[PDB]
Ligand binder design. Structure first.
Ligand SMILES: [Zn+2]
Ligand SMILES: [Zn+2]
Ligand SMILES: [Zn+2]
Ligand SMILES: [Zn+2]
Length: 90
């Protein structure tokens, strides 16, 4: 798994575009509790397939938030995966 950019001792779980940062859950809380300005940052779950990119699609059938590339790889695999309905997370 991609490491947290601040603590570099835990797997990242969220991605913050404004900070351009992959963060584990505790570092995410510490960074955005710092003040009201930071607390407005919108964050997204890190892809649960590759765990190295921000997720862009939620697939409830797979119970997985996936980045664009993992979403395409997983759902082109075969005709059952191809019918999965995903929710754009934007
Ligand atoms: Zn961390
Ligand atoms: Zn942020
Ligand atoms: Zn991915
Ligand atoms: Zn799926």
């Amino acid at each position: 798994a991609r490491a947290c950019d601040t603590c570099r001792s835990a797997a990242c779980t969220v991605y913050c575009e404004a900070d351009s940062a992959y963060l584990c859950t505790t570092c995410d809380a510490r960074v955005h509790a710092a003040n009201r300005v930071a607390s407005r940052h919108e964050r997204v779950r890190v892809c649960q397939s590759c765990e190295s990119a921000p997720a862009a699609f939620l697939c409830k059938a797979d119970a997985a938030s996936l980045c664009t590339a993992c979403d395409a790889e997983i759902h082109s695999a075969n005709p059952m995966a191809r019918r999965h309905q995903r929710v754009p997370m934007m």
